[PDB]
Amino acid sequence: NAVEIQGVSQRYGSMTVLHDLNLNLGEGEVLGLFGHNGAGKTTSMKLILGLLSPSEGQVKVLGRAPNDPQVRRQLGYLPENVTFYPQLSGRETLRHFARLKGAALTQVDELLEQVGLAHAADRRVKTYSKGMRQRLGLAQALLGEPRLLLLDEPTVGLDPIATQDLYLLIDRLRQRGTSIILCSHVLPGVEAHINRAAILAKGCLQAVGSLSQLRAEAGLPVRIRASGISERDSWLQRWTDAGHSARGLSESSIEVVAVNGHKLVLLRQLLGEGEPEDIEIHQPSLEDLYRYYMERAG
């Protein structure tokens, strides 16, 4: 129960840019905020970090004040795009944040090998790529046993080998008891590692809870994609019956949106009898869940 935002109706400029979000976050859950880059997502991101005052509402980060200096040793925040200090080194930058956060200086060597930045340490940050600074930006976030991470688009501009390795670092931190908030926009792929999503739009927090909780709260068309089929154009005429918008993208690249009452027996219409090769059943994913919840806000 680390982050407990309750009843915050946050305004500035008499705009009321955030309205009545009740965002509880557990002690091991990996939350994901998925709002736009408007005043919806980043105001709640600024509020958890304690650099904003919550107008008409309490914020209990780690059961204490959001701006108290004892809880800021237990936070780690990866910002959006950070060219840190272009004349400083790799180690001396990370040594500088170790003295600020009060962490041990022996942690700085074992974070530059936990994150793969031992080959390019002790070099200038102006000689770093965009992906290398994210490796540096993660390295200060894991500093001084952080009980609450906060990653704001942690894997943009990053190699997919390093992206897959970053989430295994994230899944290591979930078992240790450190709640992580992914303020991200790279939504295909991130739903394999979060625990509860939180889609918010126009200030109001629309939906919250796990992925199975979101599909129970929102009936979505289950997507049935299929390529390499013995038939070519039959599925675009046979499978338009029960609200199935059968659409292809090649001679056989047919996606099928079943109405989730036929989620077990339309596969019996295909794989029970019928000869396909590349069968692909998805669930209602993150994006179509995100697409349904944004249009509900209008």
- Binding residue ranges for ATP: 35-42
Please tell me whether residue 156 binds another protein under the rule CB under 8 A.
no
Smaller CB distance to its own copies: residue 81 or 127? Answer: 81
Among 15, 51, 186, 204, binds another protein (CB under 8 A): 51
3-state SS, one letter per residue, for 82-94: CCCCCCCCCHHHH
Question: Do 220 and 182 contact (CB within 8 A), yes or no?
Answer: no
Measured from the CB atom, is 45 or 246 closer to another protein?
45
Cβ closest to another protein, residue 93 vs residue 252? 93
281: contact with its own copies by CB under 8 A: yes
- Please pick, from the candidates 99, 172, 282, 296, the single residue that binds another protein as defined by CB under 8 A: 99
* Cβ-contact 256, 246 below 8 angstroms: yes
Q: Is 131 an interacting residue with respect to another protein (CB under 8 A)?
A: no
Rounded to the nearest whole angstrom, what is the least distance from the CB of residue 75 to another protein in the complex?
6
Which segments of the chain are extended strands (E)?
3-6, 8-10, 18-21, 30-33, 58-61, 75-78, 148-152, 180-183, 196-201, 204-210, 222-227, 253-258, 278-281
Nearest to 13 by CA among 39, 32, 33, 31: 39
Assess 237 for contact with another protein (CB under 8 A).
no
- Three-class secondary structure of residue 58 per DSSP: strand
- Closest CB to its own copies among residues 108, 266: 266
Task: Answer yes or no whether residue 55 interacts with another protein by CB under 8 A.
Answer: no
Q: For residue 2, which of 60, 51, 55 has the smallest C-alpha distance?
A: 60
Interface with its own copies includes 232 (CB under 8 A)? Answer: no
CB of 149 to its own copies, least distance (A): 18
User: In sequence order, which ranges of 147-285 are alpha helices (DSSP H)?
Assistant: 160-175, 211-217, 235-238, 266-267
Interface with its own copies, residue 193, by CB under 8 A: yes
**Residue placing its CB nearer to its own copies in the complex, 8 or 205:** 205
What are residue 9's DSSP bridge partners? 19
Task: List Cβ neighbours of 163 (8 Å cut-off, separation of 6 or more).
Answer: 155, 189
**Contact between 233 and its own copies (CB under 8 A)?**
no
Distance from the Cα of residue 146 to its chain's centroid = 18
Q: Which does 282 bind (CB under 5 to 8 A by kind): its own copies, another protein, none?
A: its own copies
In this structure, what token pair is assigned to residue 268? 């019996």
Say whether residue 87 binds another protein (CB under 8 A): yes
The structure tokens 């109706």 sit at: 9
Q: Which of 111, 149, 211, 256 binds its own copies (CB under 8 A)?
A: 211
Least Å from the CB of residue 233 to another protein: 39
Handedness of CA 30, 212, 282, 207 (dihedral sign): negative
In the bound complex, what is the minimum distance in angstroms from residue 43's beta carbon to its own copies? 16
Q: Which residues in this chain contact another protein in the complex, by CB under 8 A?
A: 49-51, 69-70, 72-73, 75, 77, 79-85, 87-88, 92, 96-97, 99-102, 140
Q: Which chain residues interact with its own copies by CB under 8 A?
A: 36-37, 81, 129-131, 156-161, 164, 171, 185-189, 192-193, 195, 210-212, 215, 225, 227-228, 249-250, 255, 263-264, 267-268, 271-272, 274-283, 287, 290-291, 294
